[PDB]
Amino acid sequence: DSSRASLTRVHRQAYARLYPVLLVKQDGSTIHIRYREPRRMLAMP
Template sequence: SSFLYQSRRFPCRCNANRAVLCRTKRRIYGRTYPVSLVYPNGGSIRIRFHEPRIILQIPPDLNDCSPEERQKRLLRRAPQSRLTLQEQIEDTFDQEAYSFLLKK
């Protein structure tokens, strides 16, 4: 309700964020897809998103987590080192075994 009182102080179109507060008044939404937005507490709402996804999850606030859980989440966010594969090429090709196939 405090937002309603604050919105009366400003003109109707003060910036581009004003469009986010109201619904799109169209029957067919252009280039947006219905998506479920899941909050960290487990609640969910339906929103329109520019990418076709099924679920969007908002990450939990790390300040509210326990220290052990915070450490686990930070380790999952850290970049993982990639293993470098080195190919061992064994050259066992004998050209003399196939020399009869070559015409000179």
Template sequence: MKLSQIRTLNAWSAAITKPHRYTYTRTYPTTLVNPDGSSYTIRYYEPRQIITLPLNIWTLSEAERKAKLEMRKPKSRVKYQDDLDDSYDASKYLKYVQKKK
């Protein structure tokens, strides 16, 4: 009589034990953040610390969608123009300067 080992696989075996493979791919623990703010740790093939999933703006209300689209637009910079008055006359202030002896 020949004895063989039989593995019974179910939905919990991957969560409790390691992945059963002959060749293991290198994975890194990475935090995945959902658009609603919830997060969990996954195994990712690149060494990243955090991955943020994009927000689907079509699921938002009209006011929230407009606010998010305005935030995505580039901010306009205010340009300052220097209006210099070049009517400075130094001879008007000579009476305040004292000559040193």
């Protein structure tokens, strides 16, 4: 059960868009995160 606290929404009302940008830190490990300017993937060098 890793999907309960995932079905979310921004509970604020003074918020801009967020976009499900897949992030990798260094390990080829993708996580869906919401960030400004709809990126599709990330890597921290």
